[PDB]
Amino acid sequence: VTYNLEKRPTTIVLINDTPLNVLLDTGADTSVLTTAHYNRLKYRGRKYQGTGIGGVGGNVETFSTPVTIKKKGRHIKTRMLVADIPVTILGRDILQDLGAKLVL
């Protein structure tokens, strides 16, 4: 499917068997689950201390956690960062895995 960017490009993905609405973000080097979403996952793996992410207003602490993502019939097993941010973001690391491309 094609997102023409009239609205934020969001989609539903299953993370650790839990349907979540996520933002598809080409400006994020890496993917981040909000802490509220991490707390709602049906299953959670361990939490590994991380060394934060930087954005508009500064740096925010993160922890990483193992996840299984299912979408487009793919099964991706990877680590996602967890942080108190307003929305869960699939950045370039997972977008590349899913085959997403930006066309200009």
Next chain:
Amino acid sequence: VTYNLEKRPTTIVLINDTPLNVLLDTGADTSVLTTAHYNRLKYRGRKYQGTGIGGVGGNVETFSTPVTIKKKGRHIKTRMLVADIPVTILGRDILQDLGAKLVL
């Protein structure tokens, strides 16, 4: 052209006749010029007080300014926000104007 997201999707655009490297960001609702870039423009219009942007670590103050963007043979006349952020971002408002699309 197609960006496969192995690297951040950057491109050179002319803003007020000045070539600048910009990030193409589907997770940004609006476009923002860094203050360092605003200070380097060959021409600048007035500065209109704004009511900030929110991102990862909080809210940051902004001002808006009129700009002419030239790329892909298009001539876009619009307003861009200005803020002390690390990189200049073309968000969805300008990406839509340029015809950019994200394919998943």
